[PDB]
């Protein structure tokens, strides 16, 4: 009655039957722009149901070594569907999201993902080892795509911070024995009312293994996680030909 | 006084009792901020709330 | 007009952003009520499902027997102006006589706060912020020595013509804001609005400033966010011959009328550069102090 | 002009002296400001928010330090063994330091309230067992055994369906405030001790790991509140950054 | 006497200290002030009146100075050629710099509003013709050819007894204000393109010139503003003035 | 050629949204403008001279000696206005001295 | 205060609000300015104004 | 700014003056006072013992 | 000129002219010359007692 | 990928064991007439 659930926004509806809850980062919903904080004044374009429904774009192997990935939004959909062309014709944009990440085993296998959203999640590098070398990730590492991209020191999140306390950012854990997904609900989040879904990633999706998966020789061994998510009152603006970056 | 308005903190749900001589209002003292607290919207950010004395998995 | 169903029913338009909590009062910490034992079935506080996402929602009472402790200790001191409307060291701007950096008397300074940690992981803290800002401008020689020396200090917005030496026209000043003091005088003090194009300053800008390829040698500016580079400050001692003594100028931020959304995990390794959160890779440190064994203190 | 006397303080400049400063660009007014998301109005907000304790802070290679974010449970000889103790001292270097509240806590000379840690089985769903968690007020030494720490504050935890439990650290002090403790004189404001030991056993069935983690989360309760702002203990820069 | 404290602050000379100073001429009284025409009273009022802008920028001899005021059409070969582009970044290097609203823009750090850009026909009465004029907001780079322009913001212009069409460039921005642009990070703040394509052709019938000009008219909408307030780039002034 | 600058807006040459511009006018009124202190005159005294090597000087106020200030007053033909003026001295080095 | 009438703006279209110690108002602070605009003075000085919609050459 | 003139006794530090200075800690709250036995008031008060 | 700055316990202390601690981000600093008159400053009552 | 672009649900497996795929109307004709290899595949529903 809370382990239950069902999600249905669009052509798409998606079912668990080991939940735990959902999640409204910062209390609250997304919403559209209100006509006092916008600032852009051409009259915006709201696909609604082409572009606000469940987007399963990617799986990773969850492995007894795995370190833990990351994704960037919006650019994991830049290229998907009817949401990837109006990002791509639009010069702003802006949107919500809802977060389903599943992953079930059995109850005999064990281990927990923590599963966050991180605002303004900026990559840094290793600066050359001894920290002379003042070196940046390159597009590929910022903006990854789809396939996500593997983080090198899940420990300070790739960034000099503590994973320790991502905590304090909107998540949820999936421990096998209790649940088999993640969701949690994102509003818009940006110092500015409209932005470009090109050269600015509003947040990240982190899920990392801090209690690593184990099991018995025997229980089936691939263990997938994979990533849905479906936009939240898209609007768009600004319009001319398409860009890819 | 009858200044302008142009404090970074102009319309804020915390009202602020601060002090100023001079028209922008940004020159202005820090103050006493109001005292208001919503730790829930990071401590307890769920949709459908659960008790204390309840069980959190139904 | 509208008429098929679909469109009157739809909420497509709704900017009355739904909040799940509000703010309440909390002068002072929360008090303690008297408790007794409990010995119920049904009921059980004690156990959670961090999975969910929430912390804890146990208290005191329903795990211990509690007396009544009526608590007045405030929560004055922890709200954000409180925090961060303290003066600290932010910039350190040298102008020697005989010299490699500024041996012509005058020196331009790029407005970033981020070269100095303890500042740095304050603000750090949080994603945006937004506030206004008194500047103090302390100067003295090396040796921490007052002469009679008159300096004029320029704030260059950006767009206006930095000064290219102690004589450029730009000094001229007619309508960049300008303050002429001496050595001799107090620290210089003024105060600063939020001057951002955004709504908000912020700290962390994960993009890049202009769209095109993002090939290797662009890469330094991934992260860099026009809306957060404010200008120039400039300075100058004032006159068209060089200065007979060498000077130092420090430049203290105190923050106020703040205001900050989404906190983050705060620094825990070394800062490296101003314009990235790069750091060693091969001194990954702990957070924190280490010990032998779980078992032993 | 009218007749003043300049007292003693004239011309110093104090880093918190809250004054009025001369505006440097009349008529100026800022961007408005929008909705966004999260806006905190008191750190105490933040304090209330659970993050991982470093329990097992013992590794300390570059490969391991995740190993730092749990500690392990497994299969015993049932003679109520012990499973980790620490500081509940939340100040104090070790590992409260991992958390948010330990970091904030950094920035504030003397703090008061009542603290909790939850911890969170990550076993499999087959694996059983009943924990018991102590928490030893000041002048009570690391409880030698099981019947000793049972003695103190505690609490019997039993798994299942709720993966997680939560000990309360009441607020058990002399003073009103505690300053951060450390050894020597300041041990005076310590805050007492925390034991885990196995109440029956951690027991599973054929094909279920021998062994699972636990992890630790750990925040302040509604009475707590920090007092008298300092600098934190750590300053994160080597040289000049540039 | 009244006891006082000074401040930091004291003493210092801050050019836009809007402060009170004696009056050295007691009891004078200015000669009073008739009727004058043009009153003006904010700068944005001249920012709404069109001036000539420089599109055709491009002669540099002293002799060919006032060709930079005006652009060409002539009969084409249909094929929807293009006949001319430029930025609408009003307050950077270019176009721009021809007309008072770019020069005042040069006054201040921050802008925020729509433009218009009003085109005049200067051929003769017997001359006719389509043409396409667009807008590309940012991220849309110079249109190849007239079908990409075609997909931004635009007018189709036909001549006629009007001479004139206006092209609004829209507030179509992500920040509330842009700061001025430039080559670097700062073409975050870049305005767009605007680009001029034959739609039709420019028909003549016999004994008219084959070539005509138009005259670009450009200022700021009504929703346009300014704020922070700085120095222009340019100081016109090489030794002392004499 | 009426010489009129065009009516058109925004709202009649594209489909556009309500928006509440708050962005105020505030800073391009004529005071907030020129209200601001700028350099209008140099005056030397010096001792080994040329030009005045007796300790005195006279000085025609004119400000025109000075582009920033000139080219901005120059936008307007007629101006009426009260003025504070500044004059800031010390030696060519920048040094203050005893006198 | 009850002071003299010899400001450069004495009587003028736009009323200020400012502060002053001496007799003389010139020695007052510049202050505030009203924000009134005649952008139609310099923008459309025409005899017979013509509508948006309507084509300007009738 | 507004005409002021500093009379003698300016700039001097009178150990019995009873002024206002600066807060170092702003908004900081002290602990709170329990009752504690045995008050003095004025030391007339022990002058009777 | 000097620079005084409260190290409440806890708070790290300088161990030389240079140390970083004087950043002094959130202890109280007075900046202040000998040639001025005496820095003076209101101290609260702050033990935990 | 491709698939997921179109009209569905994400089962999971639990104490219900049965899940229900709506194939909704989704027609250019009011009605359908037999859909078969040719020019009646006019009529096709879709896949599944
Ligand atoms: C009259 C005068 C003379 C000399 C200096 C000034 C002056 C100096 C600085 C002023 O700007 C203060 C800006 C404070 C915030 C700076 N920020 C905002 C965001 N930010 C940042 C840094 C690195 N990454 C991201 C953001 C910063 O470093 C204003 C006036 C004024
Ligand atoms: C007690 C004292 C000591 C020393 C100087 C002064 C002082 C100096 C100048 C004063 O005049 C200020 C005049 C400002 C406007 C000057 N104008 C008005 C018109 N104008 C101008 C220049 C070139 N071509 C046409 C007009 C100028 O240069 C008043 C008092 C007063
Ligand atoms: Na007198
Ligand atoms: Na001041
Ligand atoms: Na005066
Ligand atoms: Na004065
Ligand atoms: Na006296
Ligand atoms: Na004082």
Redo the contacts with the bound molecule.
């Keep these: 009655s809370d382990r239950v659930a069902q999600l249905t926004i669009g052509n798409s509806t998606i079912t668990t039957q080991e939940a735990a809850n959902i999640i409204v980062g910062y209390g609250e919903w997304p919403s559209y722009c209100s006509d006092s904080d916008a600032t852009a004044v051409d009259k915006p374009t709201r696909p609604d149901v082409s572009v606000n429904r469940f987007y399963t774009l990617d799986t990773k192997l969850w492995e007894k070594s795995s370190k833990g990935w990351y994704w960037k939004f919006p650019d994991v959909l830049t290229e998907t569907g009817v949401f990837g062309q109006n990002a791509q014709f639009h010069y702003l944009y802006r949107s919500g999201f809802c977060i389903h990440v599943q992953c079930n085993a059995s109850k005999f296998h064990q281990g927990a993902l923590l599963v966050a959203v991180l605002p303004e999640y900026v990559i840094g590098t290793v600066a050359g080892g001894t920290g002379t070398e003042d070196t940046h990730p390159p597009y590929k590492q910022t903006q990854p795509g789809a396939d996500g991209f593997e983080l090198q020191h899940p420990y300070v999140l790739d960034a000099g911070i503590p994973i320790s306390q991502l905590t304090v950012c909107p998540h949820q854990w999936i421990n096998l024995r209790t649940n088999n997904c993640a969701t949690i609900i994102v509003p818009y989040i940006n110092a500015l009312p409209f932005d470009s879904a090109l050269n600015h990633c509003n947040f990240g999706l982190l899920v990392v293994p801090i209690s690593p998966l184990d099991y018995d020789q025997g229980a089936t061994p691939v263990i997938p996680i994979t990533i849905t998510l479906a936009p939240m009152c898209s609007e768009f603006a600004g319009l001319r030909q398409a860009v890819t970056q | 006084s009858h200044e302008n308005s142009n404090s970074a903190t102009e319309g804020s749900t915390i009202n602020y009792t601060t002090i100023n001589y001079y028209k922008d209002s940004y020159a202005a003292t820090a103050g006493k901020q109001s005292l208001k607290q919503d730790p829930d919207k990071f401590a307890n950010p769920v949709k459908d709330i659960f008790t204390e004395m309840a069980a959190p998995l139904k | 007009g509208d008429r098929v169903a679909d469109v009157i029913e739809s909420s497509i338009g709704d900017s009355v952003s739904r909040a799940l909590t509000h703010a309440l009062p909390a002068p002072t910490g929360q008090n303690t009520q008297v408790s007794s034992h409990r010995l119920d079935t049904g009921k059980v506080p004690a156990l959670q499902a961090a999975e969910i996402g929430a912390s804890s929602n146990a208290s005191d009472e329903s795990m211990i027997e509690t007396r009544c402790v009526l608590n007045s200790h405030s929560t004055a001191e922890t709200t954000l102006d409180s925090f961060f409307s303290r003066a600290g060291l932010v910039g350190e701007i040298d102008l020697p006589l005989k010299g490699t950096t500024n041996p012509n008397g005058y020196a331009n300074w790029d407005?970033?706060?981020?070269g100095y940690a303890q500042m740095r992981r304050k603000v750090e803290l949080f994603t945006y912020m937004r506030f206004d800002?008194e500047?103090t401008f302390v100067a003295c020689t090396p040796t921490g020595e007052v002469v009679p020396q008159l300096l004029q200090?320029?704030?260059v917005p950006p767009g206006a013509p930095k000064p290219d030496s102690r004589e450029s026209l730009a000094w001229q000043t007619a309508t960049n804001?300008?303050?002429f003091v001496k050595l001799s005088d107090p620290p210089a003090q003024?105060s600063?609005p939020f001057?951002?194009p955004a709504s908000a300053?912020?700290?962390f800008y994960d993009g890049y400033p202009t769209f095109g390829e993002h090939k290797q040698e662009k890469d330094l500016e991934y992260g860099a966010?026009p809306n957060?580079m404010?200008?120039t400050?400039s300075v100058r001692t004032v006159g068209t011959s060089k200065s007979k003594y060498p000077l130092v100028v420090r430049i203290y931020?105190r923050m106020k009328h703040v205001r900050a959304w989404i906190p983050r995990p705060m620094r825990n390794q070394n800062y490296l550069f101003?314009?990235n959160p790069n750091y060693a890779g091969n001194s990954i440190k702990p957070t924190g102090a280490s010990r032998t064994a779980i078992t032993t203190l | 002009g009218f007749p003043t006397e300049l007292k003693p303080g004239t011309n110093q400049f104090l880093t918190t002296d809250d004054g009025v400063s001369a505006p440097?660009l009349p008529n100026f007014h800022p961007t408005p400001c929008i909705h966004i998301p999260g806006e905190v109005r008191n750190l105490l907000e933040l304090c209330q928010v659970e993050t991982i304790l470093e329990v097992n802070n013992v590794p300390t290679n570059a490969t391991s330090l995740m190993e730092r974010l749990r500690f392990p449970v497994s299969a015993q000889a049932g003679k109520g063994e012990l499973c980790a103790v620490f500081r509940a001292d939340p100040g104090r270097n070790g590992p409260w330091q991992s958390t948010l509240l330990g970091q904030l806590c950094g920035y504030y000379t003397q703090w008061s309230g009542s603290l909790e840690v939850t911890f969170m089985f990550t076993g499999s769903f087959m694996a059983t067992g009943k924990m018991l968690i102590a928490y030893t007020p000041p002048g009570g030494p690391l409880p030698k055994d099981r019947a000793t720490a049972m003695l103190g504050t505690h609490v019997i935890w039993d798994f299942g369906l709720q993966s997680s439990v939560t000990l309360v650290i009441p607020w058990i002090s002399n003073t009103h405030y505690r300053a951060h403790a450390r050894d020597g004189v300041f041990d005076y404001y310590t805050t007492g001790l925390v034991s885990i030991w196995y109440q029956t056993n951690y027991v599973v069935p054929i094909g279920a790991p021998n062994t699972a983690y636990i992890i630790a989360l750990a925040a302040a309760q509604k009475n707590f509140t920090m007092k008298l702002c300092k600098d934190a203990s750590d300053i994160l820069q080597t040289g000049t950054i540039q």
């Excluded at chain 3, 407005?111 to 981020?114: G, L, N």
């Design positions: 407005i970033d706060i981020t800002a500047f200090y320029m704030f804001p300008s303050v003024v600063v001057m951002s300053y912020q700290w966010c957060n404010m200008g400050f931020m101003k314009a | 440097i």
